[PDB]
Amino acid sequence: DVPVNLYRPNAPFIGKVISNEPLVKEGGIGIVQHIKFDLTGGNLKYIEGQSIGIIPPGVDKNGKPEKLRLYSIASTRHGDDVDDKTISLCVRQLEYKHPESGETVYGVCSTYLTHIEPGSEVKITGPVGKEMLLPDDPEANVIMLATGTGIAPMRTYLWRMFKDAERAANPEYQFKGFSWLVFGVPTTPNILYKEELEEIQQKYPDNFRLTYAISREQKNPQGGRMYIQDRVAEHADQLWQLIKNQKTHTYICGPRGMEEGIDAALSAAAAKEGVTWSDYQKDLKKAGRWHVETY
Numbered sequence: 001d002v003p004v005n006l007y008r009p010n011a012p013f014i015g016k017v018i019s020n021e022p023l024v025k026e027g028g029i030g031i032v033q034h035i036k037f038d039l040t041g042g043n044l045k046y047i048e049g050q051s052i053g054i055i056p057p058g059v060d061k062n063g064k065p066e067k068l069r070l071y072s073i074a075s076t077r078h079g080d081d082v083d084d085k086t087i088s089l090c091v092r093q094l095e096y097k098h099p100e101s102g103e104t105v106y107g108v109c110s111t112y113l114t115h116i117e118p119g120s121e122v123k124i125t126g127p128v129g130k131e132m133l134l135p136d137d138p139e140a141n142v143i144m145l146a147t148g149t150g151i152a153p154m155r156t157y158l159w160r161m162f163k164d165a166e167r168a169a170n171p172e173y174q175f176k177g178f179s180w181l182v183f184g185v186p187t188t189p190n191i192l193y194k195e196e197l198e199e200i201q202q203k204y205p206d207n208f209r210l211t212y213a214i215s216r217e218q219k220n221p222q223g224g225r226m227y228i229q230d231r232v233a234e235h236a237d238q239l240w241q242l243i244k245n246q247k248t249h250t251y252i253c254g255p256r257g258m259e260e261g262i263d264a265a266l267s268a269a270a271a272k273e274g275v276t277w278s279d280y281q282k283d284l285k286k287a288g289r290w291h292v293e294t295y
C-alpha cells in the first residue's frame with residue numbers, strides 16, 4: 001500500500017523546479033529553502049513522513065559521479081497546492097569550518113538545491129521510508145520533536161491535519177486528537193514556516209500546541225541557551241503522561257544530537273512511576289509508535 005521506490009538511482013524521475021523560496025528571514029542564521037518540484041509526466045506518488053533522493057550533477061574529488069542525497073518530504077501527499085501534481089523539500093545549505101581543506105566549505109547537493117532556478121530539471125528518486133508514517137486514526141495523539149530542517153515531516157503531518165484544503169480533500173481523516181510540536185532553531189527569523197504554524201495554533205488551540213526553543217533568544221533554568229531537550233525536560237511529566245496513551249505516537253527528526261537529552265528527561269519522568277523508559281521505549285518502537293529520523 002505504501003508507495004516505495006517508484007523511481008531508483010539508475011533511472012530517476014526527471015522533475016522540474018516550480019519554485020525556490022527562502023524560509024530564513026532577515027537576521028536569521030544560514031539559508032534554508034522551500035523547493036517545489038513538478039511531478040507531472042511521471043507516476044511518483046508518496047505519503048507523509050517519507051523522503052526522496054536528489055542526485056546532484058558533477059563528480060566528486062575522485063572524479064566519480066555524485067550519489068543521491070536524501071531529503072525529508074515537506075509536502076503532504078497532495079502537494080502544497082493540493083492538486084497531487086507536486087512535491088516539496090525543506091533544504092538547508094550546508095557550510096562549515098576551515099579544518100576541512102580551505103576556508104568555508106559548501107555541501108554539494110544542498111548548495112545545488114538552495115540555488116536552483118525555476119524551470120531546471122532535477123533527478124529525483126524514491127519515495128523511501130516507512131519509519132515516519134502518520135497513523136490513520138483521527139483520534140491519535142502526535143508528539144513532534146524537531147530541530148531545524150527536521151520540521152519537514154512535521155509540516156506534512158500538520159498540513160494534512162489542519163489545512164482547510166487538506167481536510168476537504170481527506171474525508172476519511174478529520175483529525176480530532178492532540179498534536180504538540182516542540183521546535184528548536186537559533187533565532188525567531190529561523191523559525192521555518194512560522195506564520196503558518198502559528199496560524200494553525202490560533203485556529204486549533206485545543207488540538208495543536210506549539211512550543212519553541214530559540215537558542216539565541218532564550219535561556220534554560222541553568223542559564224544555558226534554550227534547546228529542545230530543555231523544553232522536553234520542562235514538560236517531561238506531561239509528555240510522559242501523553243506517551244502512556246495507547247494511541248499516542250512520537251516523532252523525532254533533524255540533525256543528530258537531540259535524542260540523548262530527550263531520553264534523560266523522559267527517563268526521569270517515567271522513573272517516578274516505577275517505569276524504565278529505555279525499556280518502555282523499546283516496546284514503543286516495536287509497536288511502531290516511537291518514530292525517529294536523525295541525520
Ligand SMILES: Cc1cc2nc3c(=O)[nH]c(=O)nc-3n(C[C@H](O)[C@H](O)[C@H](O)COP(=O)(O)OP(=O)(O)OC[C@H]3O[C@@H](n4cnc5c(N)ncnc54)[C@H](O)[C@@H]3O)c2cc1C
Nearest residue numbers: 069070071072090091092094096107108109110149152295
Ligand atoms: C532520511 C534523511 C532525511 C534528510 N532530510 C533532510 C531535509 O529535509 N533537509 C535537509 O536540508 N537535509 C536533509 N538531510 C541531509 C541531506 O541528505 C544531506 O546530507 C545534506 O543536505 C548535505 O548534503 P550535501 O550534498 O549538501 O553535502 P556533502 O557535500 O556530502 O557534504 C557532507 C559531507 O561533508 C562533511 N560535513 C558535513 N557537515 C560538516 C561539519 N559541520 N564539519 C565538518 N564536516 C562536515 C561530511 O563528510 C558529510 O558526509 C536528510 C538526511 C537523511 C539521511
